[PDB]
């Protein structure tokens, strides 16, 4: 029931390394 | 012939600037001539002007010391020992000029600390910890002074900043030989006194659940309860490498925490004043206020120093979720032991009062709360009812009977429904389903039909 | 610390309290999961057995729960007879609840005891008893034994026939006992007797309840016994047509759904005619959705090709017109099913007088799209999923419609909400990925759409920017303009999450736009709050920098080739230093380091090759001595053979050792290895022995799948280099300068097409590991196992597989190849006992018996290697590489005998 | 019988429905393989014919799956050695052709000619994959010469039955036969690729009475936990009794194989005297197996399996059994 089979960005396809990366990276929320 | 080979390949590296990284590559992947690779890395650092990020030297030594492979770690380590045993004053050695390059980037990283230069210095502290850790490279007086300059700096507001100050705390606690003069001891006293009165701001703004304040409280409790192995485990976990540390330097550090600064009363008050970790779970790592308050519950100091616990435990139970942390079950156990067993014969009245009736009722009316919280509160109620029937020889001589939870509230608790829910989700609620079935079997043959 | 948990929990088991025993019993499944080896499993199951034997009937239910949960560990029990005897010693008790629990335990244990006769006797005896809990447990255990045993199946066939049509045992019990007939497929005449009994039951008890239960039983019998499934499909068509009840029709729908999913090749033409005709004259809409859902699942398989088979005009066929009026229906789900059917007819068989439906098909999609864009409900979201999947499949099957397809999609990309921009960007991403010629035809239009997102909402915003910039990277098949970089950059400076920019950066690194990857990696580098994540982002930055240096090339210019290659190597080496610093014990990044290292080695093979091509212009023809190879250049290109062939072998080794990547990452590794083989063949065809080539590429050089644009450009480069090699075969002198120019142009052509960091470089979906607990005595560390040097060493290697998540997502383990070898550590070296064995796991277990012959005098080094064999057949070289130490002692009598002799 | 009609309808659906996309042909073949195994397991009177058809369609399935491979999408130097799936498929279909012509009891010349033709297609697949692998001109030329004389042997021994079998691989192979004599071997192997692509799928007339040969070793059962104990360098005799059903000439064909847990194997020939004939269709093998080794440190699992031999090859037809063996040194 997925349109794009080679989608890198689904609901939950994020491995552990990317999980702590997202955890420490979404918190700041600013970019220069 | 080692020095002639380094001279020849160094002249070749100067001759062809591009493939110096290749000569480094062969040095790595055949583990031959480490000083040659370090010297050519220093030369290529001299060649570039790309010092906007971290140094290539820092990354290279971090890769060799703290790496997946072990034989390159042993090879670079014995290179460090061979550079250490060259006691006589000779500047031709590669290792000492690498120390001067690290000293130069120490000069550049110094201020407090800047926002863009916050993770550079943390990586540098990890590198120097590896150099005095697995590698074992004893520093000079000026290097140690500038280490104390760097670690006693002010991180601005960042989660990288709280990572820096935690690494600085373990940097101090790992090597107390690094401080030697009284002036640096006054400097670290001033730094610790700053690190006390600042924790709430970094905790609120950073948003991390793994700040430095619970680590401060942990080391206070571990020195107060004289548990040095817990300190060793904490610093080895936070630094990221296993280093063996002698207990004598930690005994001097134990004296400077127990005599001044962290007295037991202010430790208890500050540990009361910590916030709760919302959406606790077990997927978050760290060392946490829950382990802080569990350690302060094990070594009885709350009611010995007239501070409450009650709303903290209530809120932390109410802010728990899916897979459960492996600390809440002993936390509730020692909470019940604090409710029942008094602290000392000087005050037999001294105990913690249990959770009030209305709050438990508002939990079990709902769903506004989480099912993990509901199961945890059910465990608290059942274990309190069981243990209140157990430690009754001390209860009668205590004269402040906390009493059972009536029968109107106990009627308005679905026990079988939450036990079925615990059985249904037993895979992530590990350690609670077994306890609930134990309490149900030993206290409620109502429902074991 | 393996059995210590067993003694702890069994110390819990020897309490006199029910609660502590129950706690230990329910704590057993975690201990089962932690160590799965059959010594612990057998011991703990025997302890569970003799706790079950004496108990207060509530411990028994807990042990029943543990046996129900830990079903996959039941085949690991060694002492089966004692276990089953201890369990079976409770049937002869007089508490009916205890008896019912023990029959339920027998039903759970059914897999390990299929042909135990006393169990069957107990089930038959308790089955016609009068206590209701005993009866229900007996029906459960009869269902579980009847799925495996055959004599039990026939005897219980007679018994359950009697008790169903015995006119006692009221209707609830009959409903409970019909699934006994469901599990009754073992023998032909048994199945026929069950079929007759089910037909008699369904015509004898014409209720709502019994008809539903009997029909589900009857279709499970049909889907188990594949001898007359068409007869049941036929009977289902009369039940769906000629029956006024509604729930019976709904079971007919779900029944035909299951049968079409299972065995679609048995669906005959008149069956599809009957299903379509019954789908026409129905007055209801849920029933319409159900039948056309069944026809939609039937349309995805080879049933359509049987339906549209030669020996009537297919325009007049029922299915296509039914698809038309249900594609133009008011309800969204029936429209989605109808457009699936029409798309599936279009993608399938190519008869001429169907082509007009193609036009109808494409219009249907956009019509459905403009119905389901502006709704924002999960049903409408599922309709979006179904419609966009149909759009992808329709554009895939018929490419000449595809261009019209994509332009219609862009129209509904102008006016829809923030949940519809996503998944339409995904459909565009897929279509512009495999078929690229349309992607540029969007270009700038997405720009202005992206501008609108400057002032959109916030909740679904980040994913939507991710989708739009991903389809931007996919559509930019050639390059990106500087103004495009500027507008993307200024928009995500305007608002971004910080993780959104990381996703955009890794999408750009995937596609090949490494300059925006550089800039966003700079942005990440200033950011971020940990050590190894910082080092990881620095490494990715350096890789992007080297790849921009590789994009800065010019054809027929070797000076710029050497310069930009040197820049690429120095930036890759800063990056590989950062990667080595970023490696952690918890996450040991191994694919990334090896991929980057072999990329560095490939570019240095290219650098040595290009300067070796320069050596003919930098040295003599040979020497004054030489006047059929003359000169140092021959030895240098022989070294080029050695380096490139070793590099191809190392690419193959990286391919074989992963097993956890996707198709795209593996195909990219194949592209790099094929580049190495290309350069090796090109050199050994021009300079080193032209004489024995004689091939001129006698294989196919066209009609490729072309699953990515990078694949297509790689294949075009490969074909061009092989064309240059065939043309310049045996005309010129063996050294030549057209040969060196051919190598130069080949290296430039390979380095022009940039790179593609694939999915396995960033995220890992499947994680599979093997344990291989060696047990000769397992030793400790440096302590070796003593052998007596007159007998072999029974190694007894045993293993278990650990799956990270979703067991097998891409590939499935079929068999596992254990290899063992020895090595004389005293200083061939004991190659005499290289051994190989194939294992087929039952659930997760590996059990083999290895005998190792230690004969000479010394300390030997046993190494054990694993090798997974998949379903297709490719061997994969993973494994822990376990090593163990043995010392070889001698018998003093044998020593004195050897001294005397 | 419903089973007979179902088998005929399934076989006719396989034979007629051959004008498909290779994805659809693969799907139909896989579905009919699973259908035929399920039918053979359910039935016992028609188990042999269902298994025979399943083996034939398995050969056709692997042939078609090897035909569509990425190996014939890139050039010969760009070969992935490890990613090849069409290399081993020739060996499996070769072993399966042995399985048809020596497992199955009641066969006549039509089944023989069809499975011989499938063996010729198998050897063509092996020839083309070896031609794609190597680059030595002399080996490829030699293997081309052996393949052409194999085709010569096929048309010589089967000089008949060509009118009955139409539009096959070998028929229009012999149509272009003199040009196959005079061509470069690369031209020969490319025309063999083109030849296998429209090589038609033959129809197999099933024999009226067929039965599949198999063995059940009734003793030792292998579930006995006690070890067979003896002394190092000496021999132990374990009695094997097995039941053979539907085996033609067991004396020259059936053998026993012992796999030691060290890797080395033993191929024991039985005695014609020890073969019984307990009726027309079932036989009873009772022999003694002789085992010896050089002492072990614990009692290990020795493998015993009955093998069916043929003339130059051996293929398995019995369920494995395992025995515990304990060789000890002398007491002194």
Q: Give the integer Cα–Cα distance in Å for C267 and C309.
A: 13
Contact C395, C401 (CB under 8 A): yes
CB atoms near residue C122 (< 10 Å): 20
Q: Give the integer Cα–Cα distance in Å for C204 and C210.
A: 10
Q: Which ranges of C738-819 would DSSP assign to H, the alpha helix?
A: 738-752
Which two tokens mark D230? 């003896």
Q: In chain C, what residues touch B160 (CB-CB under 8 Å)?
A: 528-530
**B31 SS3 class:** coil
Q: In chain A, what residues touch C528 (CB-CB under 8 Å)?
A: 24-25
**C842 SS3 class:** coil
C69 touches chain D (CB under 8 A): no
Residue-wise DSSP of C865-882: E--EEESS--EE-----E
Residue-wise DSSP of C502-558: HHHHHHHHHHT-HHHHHHHHHHHHHS-S-HHHHHHHHHHHHHHHHHHHHHS--SS-H
- Which of D88, D293, D300 has its CB closest to that of C849? D300
- Residues within 8 A of D (CB atoms), C 591-630 only: none
Q: How many CA atoms lie within 13 A of D278 on its CB side?
A: 10
Whether D contacts A, i.e. 3 or more CB pairs less than 8 A apart, is no
Q: In chain A, what residues touch B158 (CB-CB under 8 Å)?
A: 28
Mutate to test the interface with C, among D38, D77, D189 (most CBs of C within 10 A): D77
Which two tokens mark B188? 């670290």
Residue-wise DSSP of D8-43: HHHHHHHHH--SS-HHHHHHHHHHHHHHHHHHHHH-
Please, is C219 exposed, middle or buried when counting C-beta atoms within 10 Å of its C-beta (0-12, 13-18, 19+)?
buried
Contact C845, C36 (CB under 8 A): yes
Residue of C nearest to D21 (CA): C349
Q: Which ranges of B32-118 would DSSP assign to H, the alpha helix?
A: 34-47, 56-65, 71-84, 94-109
Which two tokens mark C32? 């089962």
Q: What's the N-to-C CA distance of chain D in angstroms? A: 71
Q: Give the integer Cα–Cα distance in Å for C770 and C797.
A: 12
Contact A27 B158 (CB under 8 A): no
Residue of A nearest to B157 (CA): A28
Q: Give the integer Cα–Cα distance in Å for C43 and C57.
A: 22
Q: In chain C, what residues touch A30 (CB-CB under 8 Å)?
A: 498
For B108, residues 6+ apart whose C-beta sits below 8 A from its C-beta are: none
Contact C248, C212 (CB under 8 A): yes
Q: Using what technique was this structure determined?
A: cryo-EM
* Helix (H), strand (E), coil (C) string for C240-264: HHCCCCCHHHHHHHHHHHHHHHHCH
C641 touches chain D (CB under 8 A): no
Q: How many CA atoms lie within 13 A of C154 on its CB side?
A: 8
How far CA C738 is from CA of C556, C561, C613, C729, in Å, comes to 13, 18, 11, 11
If residue B199 lies in a helix (H) or strand (E), which one and from where to where?
helix B199-206
Helix axes C117-127, C151-164, angle to 10 degrees: 0
For CA atoms D241, D247, D250, D256, the dihedral sign is negative
Q: Give the integer Cα–Cα distance in Å for C82 and C87.
A: 9
CA of C788 vs chain A CAs: smallest distance (Å): 49
- For chain B, the chains sharing at least 3 beta-carbon pairs closer than 8 angstroms are A, C
Q: Give the integer Cα–Cα distance in Å for B205 and B213.
A: 14
For C211, residues 6+ apart whose C-beta sits below 8 A from its C-beta are: C202, C205, C245, C248
Instruction: Give the alpha-carbon dihedral of C744, C750, C752, C753, to 10 degrees.
Output: 170
| Nearest residue to C754 (alpha-carbon basis) of C470, C433, C538, C478 | C478
Q: Give the integer Cα–Cα distance in Å for B154 and B117.
A: 12
Please, is B66 exposed, middle or buried when counting C-beta atoms within 10 Å of its C-beta (0-12, 13-18, 19+)?
buried
CB atoms near residue B205 (< 10 Å): 14
CA of C600 vs chain B CAs: smallest distance (Å): 10
Q: Give the integer Cα–Cα distance in Å for C417 and C686.
A: 60
C535 touches chain B (CB under 8 A): yes
D79 touches chain C (CB under 8 A): yes
Mutate to test the interface with D, among C115, C187, C188, C308 (most CBs of D within 10 A): C188
Contact C594, C651 (CB under 8 A): no
Peptide bond into D220 cis (omega under 30): yes
How far CA D253 is from CA of D270, D274, D307, in Å, comes to 10, 14, 8
Q: In chain A, what residues touch C429 (CB-CB under 8 Å)?
A: 4, 7
Contact D308, D316 (CB under 8 A): yes
Q: How many CA atoms lie within 13 A of D191 on its CB side?
A: 17
- Sequence-separated contacts (24+) of C716-720 with Cβ below 8 Å: C717/C749, C717/C750, C717/C752, C717/C753, C718/C674, C718/C675, C718/C678, C718/D74, C718/D75, C718/D78, C720/C749
Q: Give the integer Cα–Cα distance in Å for C84 and C99.
A: 15
**C97 SS3 class:** helix
Q: Give the integer Cα–Cα distance in Å for D264 and C206.
A: 67
CA of D116 vs chain C CAs: smallest distance (Å): 26
Radius of gyration of chain D (CA): 24
- Gapped junctions in chain A, after residues (C–N > 2.5 Å): none
Contact C498 A25 (CB under 8 A): yes
| Nearest residue to D325 (alpha-carbon basis) of C794, C383, C67 | C794
Q: Give the integer Cα–Cα distance in Å for C846 and C795.
A: 14
Q: Give the integer Cα–Cα distance in Å for D230 and C693.
A: 61
Contact D246, D267 (CB under 8 A): no
By DSSP bridging, strand D321-328 and strand D228-231 are parallel
Helix axes B289-298, B328-340, angle to 10 degrees: 40
| Nearest residue to C543 (alpha-carbon basis) of C516, C519, C574 | C574
Between chain C and chain D, how many beta carbons pairs sit less than 8 Å apart?
144
């Amino acid at each position: 029931a997925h349109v794009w089979e080679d989608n890198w960005d689904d609901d939950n396809v994020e491995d552990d390394f990317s999980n702590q990366l997202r955890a420490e990276l979404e918190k700041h929320g600013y970019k220069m | 012939g080692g020095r002639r080979r380094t001279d020849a390949l160094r002249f070749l590296c100067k001759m062809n600037p591009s493939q110096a990284l290749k000569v480094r590559g062969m040095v790595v992947e055949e583990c031959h001539l480490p000083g040659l690779g370090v010297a050519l890395t220093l030369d290529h650092t001299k060649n570039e002007a790309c010092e906007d990020g971290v140094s290539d030297l820092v990354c290279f030594v971090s890769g060799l010391l703290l790496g997946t492979n072990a034989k390159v770690r042993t090879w670079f380590g014995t290179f460090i020992r061979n550079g250490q045993q060259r006691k006589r004053e000779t500047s031709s050695s590669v290792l000492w000029q690498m120390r001067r390059q690290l000293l130069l980037e120490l000069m550049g990283i110094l201020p407090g600390l800047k926002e863009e230069h916050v993770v550079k210095a943390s990586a540098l502290l990890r590198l120097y910890c590896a150099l005095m850790g697995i590698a074992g490279l004893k520093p000079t007086e000026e290097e140690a002074e500038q280490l104390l300059q760097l670690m006693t700096s002010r991180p601005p507001a960042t989660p990288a900043g709280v990572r820096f100050v935690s690494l600085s705390f373990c940097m101090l606690l790992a090597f107390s030989t690094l401080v030697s003069t009284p002036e640096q001891e006054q400097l670290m006293v001033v730094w610790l006194s700053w690190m006390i009165k600042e924790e709430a701001y970094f905790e609120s703004t950073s948003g991390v659940s793994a700040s430095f304040g619970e680590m401060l409280l942990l080391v206070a409790m571990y020195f107060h309860s004289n548990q040095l192995s817990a300190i060793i485990d904490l610093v080895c976990s936070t630094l990221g490498m296993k280093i063996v540390i002698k207990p004598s330097s930690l005994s001097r550090m134990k004296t400077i925490f127990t005599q001044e600064i962290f007295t037991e009363q202010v430790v208890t008050a500050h540990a009361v004043r910590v916030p709760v970790t919302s959406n606790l779970s077990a997927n978050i790592t760290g060392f946490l206020p829950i382990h802080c308050i569990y350690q302060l519950l094990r070594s009885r100091s709350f009611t010995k120093h007239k501070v409450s616990i009650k709303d903290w435990i209530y809120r932390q139970l109410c802010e728990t979720s899916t897979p459960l942390h492996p600390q809440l079950l002993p936390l509730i156990d020692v909470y019940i032991n604090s409710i029942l067993t008094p602290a000392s014969k000087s005050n037999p009245e001294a105990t913690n009062q249990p959770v009030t009736e209305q709050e438990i009722l508002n939990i079990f009316q709902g769903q506004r709360f989480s099912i993990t919280a509901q199961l945890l509160v059910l465990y608290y109620i059942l274990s309190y009812e069981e243990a209140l029937l157990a430690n009754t020889k001390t209860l009668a001589a205590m004269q402040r009977k906390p009493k059972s939870y009536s029968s109107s509230l106990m009627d308005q608790i679905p026990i079988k429904f939450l036990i079925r829910q615990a059985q249904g989700l037993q895979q992530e609620l590990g350690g609670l389903h077994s306890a609930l079935l134990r309490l149900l079997a030993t206290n409620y043959p109502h429902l074991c039909i | 610390d393996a059995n210590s948990a067993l003694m702890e929990l069994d110390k819990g088991l020897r309490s006199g309290k029910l609660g502590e025993q129950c706690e230990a019993v329910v704590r057993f499944p975690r201990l089962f999961q932690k160590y799965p080896f059959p010594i612990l499993i057998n011991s703990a199951f025997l302890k569970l057995a003799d706790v079950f034997r004496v108990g207060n009937n509530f411990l028994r239910l807990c042990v029943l729960k543990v046996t129900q949960q830990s079903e996959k560990h039941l085949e690991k029990i060694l002492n089966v007879d004692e276990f089953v005897k201890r369990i079976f010693s409770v049937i002869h008790s007089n508490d009916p609840v205890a008896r019912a629990i023990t029959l339920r335990m027998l039903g759970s244990l059914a897999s390990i005891i299929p042909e135990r006769k006393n169990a069957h006797h107990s089930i038959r005896q308790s089955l016609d008893s009068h206590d209701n809990v005993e009866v229900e447990a007996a029906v459960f255990a009869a269902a579980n034994f009847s799925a495996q045993s055959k004599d039990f199946a026939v005897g219980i066939c007679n018994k359950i026939s009697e008790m169903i049509q015995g006119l006692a045992t009221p209707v609830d019990l009959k409903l409970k006992l019909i699934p006994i007939l469901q599990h009754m497929h073992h023998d032909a005449i048994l199945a026929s007797s069950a079929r007759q009994l089910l037909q008699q039951l369904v015509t004898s008890y014409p209720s709502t309840k019994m008809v539903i239960v009997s029909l589900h039983t009857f279709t499970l019998l049909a889907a188990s016994s594949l001898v007359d499934t068409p007869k049941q499909i036929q009977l289902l068509l009369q039940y769906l047509k000629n029956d006024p009840r509604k729930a019976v029709k709904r079971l007919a729908i779900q029944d035909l759904k299951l049968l079409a999913n299972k065995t679609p090749h048995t669906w005959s033409r008149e069956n599809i005619q009957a299903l379509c005709e019954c789908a026409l004259q129905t007055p209801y809409d849920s029933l319409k959705l159900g039948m056309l859902s069944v026809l939609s699942t039937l349309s995805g398989t080879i049933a359509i090709k049987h339906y549209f088979s030669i020996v009537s005009s297919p325009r007049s066929s029922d299915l296509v017109k039914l698809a038309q009026e249900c594609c133009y229906h008011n309800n969204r789900g029936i429209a989605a099913h109808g457009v699936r059917v029409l798309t599936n007819i279009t993608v399938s068989c190519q008869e001429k007088d169907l082509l007009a439906l193609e036009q109808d098909a494409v219009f249907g999609l956009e019509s459905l799209l403009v119905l389901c864009s502006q709704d924002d409900s999960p049903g409408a979201q599922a309709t979006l999923k179904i419609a966009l999947n149909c759009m992808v499949k329709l554009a895939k099957g018929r490419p000449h419609l595809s261009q019209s397809v994509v332009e219609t999609l862009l129209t509904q990309l102008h006016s829809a909400q923030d949940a519809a921009r996503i998944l339409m960007c995904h459909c565009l991403a897929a279509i512009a990925m495999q078929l690229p010629v349309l992607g540029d035809g969007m270009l700038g239009d997405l720009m202005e759409l992206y501008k609108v997102i400057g002032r959109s909402a916030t909740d679904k915003q980040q994913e939507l920017l991710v989708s739009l910039a991903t389809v931007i990277f996919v559509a930019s098949q050639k390059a990106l303009s500087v103004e495009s970089k500027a507008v993307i950059k200024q928009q995500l400076e305007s608002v971004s999450n910080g993780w959104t920019v990381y996703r955009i950066a890794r999408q750009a690194s995937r596609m090949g736009n490494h300059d925006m990857a550089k800039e966003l990696y700079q942005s990440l580098l200033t950011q971020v709050a940990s050590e190894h994540f910082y080092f990881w982002l620095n490494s990715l930055k350096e890789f992007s920098h080297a790849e921009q240096c590789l994009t800065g090339l010019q054809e027929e210019n070797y000076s710029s080739a050497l310069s930009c290659i040197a820049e690429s190597l120095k930036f890759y080496h800063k990056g590989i230093a950062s990667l080595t610093a970023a490696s952690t014990p918890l996450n040991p990044l191994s694919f990334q380091c090896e991929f980057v290292k072999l990329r560095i080695d490939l570019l240095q093979a290219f650098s040595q090759l290009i300067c070796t091509c320069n050596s003919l212009k930098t040295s003599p023809p040979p020497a004054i001595a030489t006047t059929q190879r003359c000169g140092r250049i021959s030895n240098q290109m022989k070294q080029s053979m050695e380096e490139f062939r070793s590099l191809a072998s190392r690419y193959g080794d990286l391919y074989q050792a992963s097993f956890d990547a996707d198709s795209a990452t593996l195909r990219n590794v194949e592209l790099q290895q094929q580049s190495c083989l290309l350069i090796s063949h090109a050199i050994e065809a021009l300079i080193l022995d032209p004489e024995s080539a004689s091939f001129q590429e006698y294989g196919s050089t066209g009609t490729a799948h072309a699953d990515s644009e990078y694949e297509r450009r790689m294949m075009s480069v490969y074909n061009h280099v092989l064309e240059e090699v065939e043309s310049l075969n045996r005309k010129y002198t063996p050294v030549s300068y057209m040969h060196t120019a051919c190598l130069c142009n080949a290296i430039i052509a390979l380095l022009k097409v940039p790179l593609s960091f694939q999915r396995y470089f960033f995220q890992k979906l499947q994680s599979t590991s093997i344990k291989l607990a060696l047990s000769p005595s397992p030793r400790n560390p440096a302590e070796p196992i003593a052998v007596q040097n007159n007998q072999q060493l029974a190694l007894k290697v045993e293993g278990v597989v650990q799956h990270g998540s979703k067991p097998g997502l891409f590939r499935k383990i079929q068999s596992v190849c254990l290899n063992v070898s020895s090595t004389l550590q005293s200083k061939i070296d004991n190659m005499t006992n290289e051994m190989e064995q194939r294992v087929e796991p039952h659930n997760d277990y590996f059990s083999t018996q290895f005998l190792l012959n230690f004969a000479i005098l010394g300390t030997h080094n046993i190494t054990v290697e694993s090798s997974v064999k998949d379903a297709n057949g490719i061997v994969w070289k993973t494994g822990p590489r376990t090593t163990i130490f043995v010392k070889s002692l001698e018998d003093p009598y044998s020593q004195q005998i050897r001294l005397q002799q | 019988d419903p089973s007979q009609q179902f088998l005929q309808q399934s076989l006719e659906r396989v034979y007629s429905l051959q004008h498909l996309d290779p994805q659809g042909a693969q799907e139909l073949l896989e579905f009919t393989i699973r259908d035929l195994q399920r039918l053979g397991e359910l039935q016992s009177e028609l188990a042999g014919v269902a298994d025979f058809s399943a083996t034939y369609l398995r050969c056709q399935l692997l042939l078609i799956k090897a035909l569509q491979e990425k190996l014939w999408n890139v050039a010969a130097p760009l070969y992935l050695k490890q990613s090849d799936l069409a290399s081993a498929a020739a060996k499996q279909i070769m072993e399966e052709t042995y399985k048809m012509e020596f497992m199955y009891s009641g066969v006549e010349n039509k089944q023989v000619v069809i499975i011989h033709h499938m063996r010729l297609q198998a050897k063509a697949l092996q020839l083309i994959v070896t031609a794609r692998t190597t680059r030595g001109l002399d080996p490829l030329f030699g293997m081309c010469e052996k393949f052409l004389q194999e085709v010569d042997f096929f048309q010589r021994y089967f000089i008949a039955d060509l009118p009955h079998l139409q539009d096959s691989f070998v028929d229009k192979l012999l149509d272009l036969m003199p040009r196959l004599m005079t061509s470069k071997p690369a031209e020969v192997v490319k025309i063999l690729q083109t030849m296998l692509r429209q090589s038609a799928f033959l129809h197999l007339p099933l024999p009226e009475q067929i039965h599949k040969a198999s063995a059940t070793i009734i003793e030792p059962a292998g579930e006995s936990d006690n070890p067979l104990r003896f002394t190092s360098g000496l021999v132990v005799a374990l009695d094997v009794d097995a039941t053979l059903e539907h085996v033609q000439d067991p004396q020259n064909t059936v053998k026993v194989q012992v796999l030691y847990p060290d890797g080395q194997a033993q191929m024991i020939h039985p005695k014609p005297a020890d073969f019984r004939n307990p009726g027309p269709g079932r036989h009873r093998l009772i022999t003694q197996v002789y085992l010896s080794h050089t002492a072990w440190t614990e009692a290990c699992q020795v493998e015993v399996r009955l093998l069916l031999a043929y003339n130059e090859g051996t293929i398995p037809f019995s369920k494995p059994v395992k025995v515990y063996i304990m060789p000890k040194p002398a007491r002194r």
